[model samples]
Target: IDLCLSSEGSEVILATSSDEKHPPENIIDGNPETFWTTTGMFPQEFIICFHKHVRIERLVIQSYFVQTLKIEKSTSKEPVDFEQWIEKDLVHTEGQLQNEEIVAHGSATYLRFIIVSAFDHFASVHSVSAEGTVVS
Candidate 1:
């Protein structure tokens, strides 16, 4: 599956999940709702793109089982095909905790994270914590 965030018409501020009933714990009191899974199995991926230049600080990801997070970017003005882009190692996994804070470098218009593997039965994410500068 694909998790996408659009920046059109308005400031493009929203949150999405593979499943809604089990939203991540952190999103319980935000403008956006939580996103999560029940079975603890998430063979899905997410892609968030910035329409303009912005500085990305950190990301907090929550999962039930062991999972991986990858980030990629492109110097070209064209849209980045994450499938063909370079990939980073696993950011965090499950069984560790439900939250993580990662410091990101530089600015990117396109970002993606894939669940490479799982620890237990499957892997599912609760919510994504994104911090960055203004985009315009």
Candidate 2:
């Protein structure tokens, strides 16, 4: 699932296989400045864009409904074919907000989180945070 703050308020959407190529669909919930939840998908990597520019140092992912997390980079465009861009290992199995640090290079505008293994509740992500230098 993905959440973004808009003109109205905080909106939540489910991240599905079809939505993977496009933006999320259905407002699961709403709030302000905060959107936290979990959704499911295939045993493949998913991509999410970060509007704010930052120098990524590490990624902290909490998987309550999922397992096996891998991070990779995509091309300048969306709906990227994995065969085009490079693939790197970020996290193997991060269950429940474990500290998974990745010493990678590159100022990314987009991040691809691939789910290799999933649990009964689909591939759900409790929380995802990045420790980095925010470029202003």
Candidate 3:
């Protein structure tokens, strides 16, 4: 299932990013327009938990002003165990959002994304999607 596009499947359990109007919880929605904005600085992150342990194979992330991204996943029963799944330096496009499509192979109940660097002070994440199936 495309967990991020559904009504209820995944949720942000830990959020290091925050905005008054556009909170980190907004990332779970299927909105291509709604955005999740960071509060102040870099080195922020978001940790998402799935209803089922999903074997994620692909990731699509859309954001603005983000320069570097680090992704991690945990298949543990709790949100404890994790490993570096992917790390990328995103390129910028003027007057346009930065988009990344990652090919990943991992089964995880929790997934984390860290914003290590940014072009601007505030980084806004438009969407986060994982393509996978619920492990049975």
Candidate 4:
């Protein structure tokens, strides 16, 4: 349950941080109204690091205009490497956010996500939530 949040000792990084009004921290701020936006490009990336090793059972994404997304997991502290865990090809959603979920049972110290493609010129993510058990 709710494995990653800044108050829970989790940290995040948005690959192309943009807009002081919508900083990367907005992604996991636990409020859907605030978001982290892309710099109008494909393959936008973000990574979340858990202070403890975690075993995730479900992954959830709340985004807009994201067409292709990839999920990766790393068991180490460094963000230098990760193994591909899941990939999703999304459809269009009008007047609503892209809500996607995946079932997983992977152990991760760092969770990295990549937006490989999108339905529009830009993409945004409101939250990246995970359900997991602490392993460390």
Candidate 5:
């Protein structure tokens, strides 16, 4: 299932963010055309709260100019006490999207992505899809 649908009532929170045009919400709107971009500096992070527990199996990320990415998650009701999950250093690619697939298996209510470094001054995320089944 596409976990990025806003209709699911999920919330996107950013450590540092932009305006309405390039807000963090763009990452989960299920639209590749629209995106959320870092305004300045690296180590930018955003948290996606699924509003409930989910058995996430895989994560598909479409980004640009990203060098290193880190993902963490929390299964608790509140968005605290997150545990480090995935860490990867992406290969530099020019004029092409960095299509990365992360095989993540766990139960999570909140997932956080930290862009530790970028190939350039700025990094952008076109879309993020979490495929999984809802834990009832």
Candidate 6:
């Protein structure tokens, strides 16, 4: 299932940064044309709360200039108790999409993404899609 589309009535919380034009909500809006961009220094992060527990099978991310990414998840109703899930270094491709697929194996109510580093001054996330099955 498309987790992003199922994220209706859910929450997309973003870390402190600039650029209101591109908010965290854009990532789960199921639109690739629109995006959420980071404005400040390194290590920009965002959390996607499913509002319910979900068994995430895989995740696809479309970004630009992103060098390293770290993923974490929490099954609790509260946004606490997150465990590290996936971490990888992305290859930089000039004028190309940094399409990364992360195979995940867990159930969680919230998934957090931390962009550790980028190839450019600013990093942009065009879209993020999660494929999963809902639990209960």
Runs of candidate 4 exceeding 4 Å displacement: none
Give the C-alpha miss distance for residue 84 in model 1, angstroms.
10
Task: Estimate, for each residue in 86-125, the C-alpha lDDT of model 3 and write its tens digit.
Answer: 9899988999988789987788888888989888877888
- Per-model TM-score, in order, reads 0.56, 0.51, 0.93, 0.94, 0.93, 0.92
lDDT per residue as tens, model 4, 1-136: 1887777778787466577777878877788888888876677888998878998988888899888989888998788679998988988868989888888789999988898988888888888899978884
Candidate 6, which segments miss by more than 4 Å at Cα?
none
- Go through the candidates in order and give each one's C-alpha lDDT: 0.46, 0.43, 0.82, 0.84, 0.85, 0.82
What TM-score should be assigned to candidate 3?
0.93
Candidate 1 root-mean-square deviation in Å: 6.4
List candidate 5 segments past 4 Å from native: none
Regions of candidate 2 where Cα sits further than 4 Å from its true position: 1-14, 17-41, 75-105
Distance from true location, Cα of 103 in model 1, Å: 1.3
Q: lDDT per residue, candidate 2, 28-119, as tens digits? A: 22222232323444654445555544466665554444455666643344434433233333333433333344555555555666666655
**Candidates 3 and 4: which is better by lDDT?**
4
Positional deviation of residue 25's Cα in model 2 after best superposition, in angstroms: 10
Best by TM-score: 4
lDDT over C-alpha atoms for residue 49 of model 3: 83
Candidate 1 accuracy as lDDT: 0.46
